[PDB]
């Protein structure tokens, strides 16, 4: 009831200021074991989850939703949001994943954990794609907010009031993306093409999350890593 009043510049400003902090890892740069690396990654993810929730409530229109629907959106999208963040900060590091400023991992270190190098390859490919497109920070925060609102909306009485509100905010972010591109001097045809290019990447990000959810579940059942209660509940929501 207020996010609709935001201008394109104000949407960007609100999103930029809502950005979560970049966290460090406990990593003592002692060599990796398989359990060691999974520990670092999951510990990091768990701490990031806490900040993600603060961020989500600062995403324009999110607090207007019921507490139930906020839970559903975050449960659905949390790994997607973690991954696009990872991919974004890894953009200027070709062939490397910047989980934290003190935890920069190349592809072959994905092999430390069974079945993780396939996940790394997908993440790196996405980062390479962002780098190819020269993805801007302002575009990035728009994309991440889109993921939060869109990923779980299809799996939702006056429930339509929530859905229509979410879609109305989604259109606003689309307007914001286009605004950024027009401001960058892109022609009308180039704006529509770039918009499409950015959104189709979200299809691959969804794919990576689904794959990552399965991998994380497999590592869980084997108990190579003790997952936090919060992380376990987020994983449980996808009921694999």
């Amino acid at each position: 009831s207020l996010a609709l009043s935001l201008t394109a510049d104000q949407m960007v400003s609100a999103l930029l200021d809502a950005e979560p902090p970049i966290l460090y890892s406990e990593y003592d740069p002692r060599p990796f074991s398989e359990a060691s690396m999974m520990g670092l990654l999951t510990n990091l993810a768990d701490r990031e989850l806490v900040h993600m929730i603060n961020w989500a409530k600062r995403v324009p229109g999110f607090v207007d939703l019921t507490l139930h629907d906020q839970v559903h959106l975050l449960e659905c999208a949390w790994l997607e949001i973690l991954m696009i963040g990872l991919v974004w900060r890894s953009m200027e590091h070709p062939g490397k994943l910047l989980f934290a400023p003190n935890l920069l991992l190349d592809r072959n270190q994905g092999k430390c954990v069974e079945g993780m190098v396939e996940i790394f390859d997908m993440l790196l490919a996405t980062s390479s794609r962002f780098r190819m497109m020269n993805l801007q920070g302002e575009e990035f925060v728009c994309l991440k907010s889109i993921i939060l609102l869109n990923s779980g909306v299809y799996t939702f009485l006056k429930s339509l009031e929530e859905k229509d509100h979410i879609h109305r905010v989604l259109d606003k972010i689309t307007d914001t993306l286009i605004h950024l591109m027009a401001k960058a001097g892109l022609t009308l045809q180039q704006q529509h093409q770039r918009l499409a290019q950015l959104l189709l990447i979200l299809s691959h990000i969804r794919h990576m999350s689904n794959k990552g959810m399965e991998h994380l579940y497999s590592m869980k059942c084997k108990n190579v890593v003790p997952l936090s209660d919060l992380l376990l509940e987020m994983l449980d929501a996808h009921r694999l």
Binding site: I53, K57, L67, L230, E233
Partner: peptide, 10 residues
């Protein structure tokens, strides 16, 4: 759920 508590506590 923990997520419930976190969303209420800001």
């Amino acid at each position: 759920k923990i997520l419930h508590r976190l969303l209420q506590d800001s």
